Design a binder for this molecule. Structure first.
Ligand SMILES: NC(=O)C1=CN([C@@H]2O[C@H](COP(=O)(O)OP(=O)(O)OC[C@H]3O[C@@H](n4cnc5c(N)ncnc54)[C@H](O)[C@@H]3O)[C@@H](O)[C@H]2O)C=CC1
Ligand SMILES: NC(=O)C1=CN([C@@H]2O[C@H](COP(=O)(O)OP(=O)(O)OC[C@H]3O[C@@H](n4cnc5c(N)ncnc54)[C@H](O)[C@@H]3O)[C@@H](O)[C@H]2O)C=CC1
Ligand SMILES: C[C@@H](O)[C@H](N)C(=O)O
Ligand SMILES: C[C@@H](O)[C@H](N)C(=O)O
Ligand code: NA
Ligand code: NA
Lengths: 321, 320
């Protein structure tokens, strides 16, 4: 049978495109998408059935929703990310720790296959910055990263103790056109496309040769589905690195200027994103993911930049050609 | 002379640590607290500067710290390996939230803060022989999971805010005064009691499962020394320390050498065994030795002599 899929924190950058892909793939009646906020008037999930409000900090309301829908899969997405978590750490520790605790308990009690994403932010400067391994020293420099190490370890314990089918990937920076990003260090990339279409100066808070692992949303969606469709027997671990390709702001800029045939104005003025990003790996080793469940990546930076420069005007109404 | 707050003070470590701090620094300079009040036979009963505080009551915790103005804090409340696997919601509440509250008070009220970690923070990928200070951490217990969180959170407080967070990964700690709180290494203490009562000891750790351990007097020396060290000596926030490693069969032999009497011990593969088997056999504590002079006086036989002398005195068990 097709799965019944619950998405929590579903209205954000990842949730928006994942929810659309799941409804398309499995049918709208087999998918329940939820978030603590309502879709805004321009949000692609506005006016649709199967969209609920849920604050995942309310464990009793989380249970009620799970009881009623009876999911077989859950993608638990709420988290406060790197830059915002440094400014709002008490909020990051509440959401990132307690919502995860609650989601895992419900996966236990209701026999749900549960995906909680981790992040390159779980790594710090001791990880081995080149082709970082799946198992290595983790010394995250942000409270977000600290909370995502805890997530990985706590999920893994739920699998060992109770047999909860917990699965996770360490996502790189995710690029998409649909929903603006939620305040991480990689957010500059999305913002540089908007500046280029508006012909405005881009003030980039990440320095020009700071390379980071990144991935374009279509590849991300294929992997998020693939890892959840895999039989449990095929998975040799609970947490996998995945990457798309790495780039620096200067490489992103060169790619956009190739597509628009048009020089863009960028000022590099260091923001908190920089020192955060500088502590992250430059690239990841994702061989285990490729071997166990078939992770792959089809987009390169120029393909991405062609697609983003097309989609942003369509979805957000900015000047195109 | 510092002003020292100890939370979780009525337990195995806190009982002895609290007495040692009062003796070194003066009773007037040491305030200790616990969620429970001490019973009439507790070593801390009847002493001034022993308060009732639930560290999950953040306003109460803040009130106490503000009034006393500690310069040092030892934050000891935690649910340990065996008990945490049976009561994991309590472990996650206590081990994560009280730690978060303690670090926030250390930041706001300028306190040098010690929070112990543990060998439980390691699992089967750590390199179980002479485990390094920096390695892969894959703990198999919710207690260990929460202690990796504690180390990484405390380290983030130091990097971000300049808070003087200090930690060691403690081995199994042996002492006579206060019975232990539900960890896998508790068999060791229980075997000395069984030997003195001449009862059969049912040991839930298999006979050759060796673990890092330390006797309390060495523990107390190091817990003070690390806190006294100047920052310029410390290259790390979290240090391994160890005393010596032993298995249950080794302990049994040490006890039988003292009493010249055989103890009846039945070994079984209990919950403790599956936990203990995931932990290191020995630790590399070279960084702690080099940076701040961690040192160990007791070996297994000295320890056993002292324990068999002290348990009768402190608990009324039959002597010799
Ligand atoms: N965007 C990225 O590059 C990466 C994201 N991931 C992660 O994947 C996740 C989803 O990320 P994004 O979609 O980019 O974040 P986002 O910030 O765009 O979306 C997060 C959503 O969570 C919801 N939320 C916050 N608190 C909630 C609560 N108490 N209950 C229910 N919903 C709540 C928000 O309203 C929001 O719509 C996270 O766990 C994040 O760490 C990890 C790595 C990469
Ligand atoms: N005993 C050992 O072998 C080892 C202990 N450590 C640790 O050192 C610590 C102290 O350990 P033990 O003395 O052996 O534990 P214990 O279980 O003997 O003492 C814990 C004490 O904390 C108190 N407590 C629990 N909840 C509290 C709360 N909400 N507010 C205030 N007090 C609360 C208990 O009443 C208690 O007296 C822990 O953090 C533990 O992880 C780490 C490694 C070795
Ligand atoms: C990389 C991921 O964790 C997120 N976009 C961040 O920058 O925090
Ligand atoms: C070793 C320490 O963490 C504790 N005595 C336990 O056995 O859990
Ligand atoms: Na980097
Ligand atoms: Na061991």
């Amino acid at each position: 049978h097709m799965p019944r899929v619950l998405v929590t924190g579903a209205l954000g950058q990842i949730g928006t495109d994942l929810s659309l892909a799941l409804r398309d793939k499995f049918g709208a009646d087999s998918v329940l998408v939820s978030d603590v906020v309502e879709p805004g008037a321009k949000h692609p999930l506005a006016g649709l059935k199967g969209v609920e409000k849920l604050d995942c900090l309310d464990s009793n309301g989380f249970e009620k929703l799970v009881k009623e829908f009876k999911p077989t899969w859950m993608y638990h997405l709420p988290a406060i990310m790197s830059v915002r978590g440094e400014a709002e750490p008490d909020l990051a520790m509440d959401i990132n720790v307690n919502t995860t605790r609650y989601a895992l308990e419900l996966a236990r009690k209701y026999n749900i296959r549960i995906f909680i994403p981790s992040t390159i932010a779980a790594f710090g400067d001791k990880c081995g910055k080149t082709m970082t391994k799946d198992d290595t020293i983790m010394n995250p420099s942000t409270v977000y990263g600290v909370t995502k190490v805890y997530t990985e370890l706590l999920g893994t314990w739920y699998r060992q103790k109770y047999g909860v089918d917990f699965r996770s990937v360490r996502l790189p920076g995710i690029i998409s056109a649909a929903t603006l990003p939620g305040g991480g260090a990689t957010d500059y990339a999305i913002h540089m496309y908007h500046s280029a279409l508006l012909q405005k100066k881009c003030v980039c808070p990440v320095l020009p040769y700071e390379s980071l692992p990144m991935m374009y949303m279509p590849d991300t969606l294929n992997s998020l589905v693939k890892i959840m469709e895999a039989p449990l027997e095929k998975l040799t671990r609970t947490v996998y690195n995945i990457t798309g390709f790495s780039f620096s702001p200067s490489e992103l800029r060169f790619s956009i200027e190739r597509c628009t045939d048009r020089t863009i104005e960028v000022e590099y003025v260091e923001g908190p994103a920089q020192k955060i990003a500088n502590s992250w790996p430059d690239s990841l080793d994702d061989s285990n993911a490729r071997n166990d469940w078939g992770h792959q990546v089809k987009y390169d930076i120029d393909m991405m930049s062609e697609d983003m420069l097309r989609q942003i005007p369509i979805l957000h109404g900015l000047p195109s050609l």
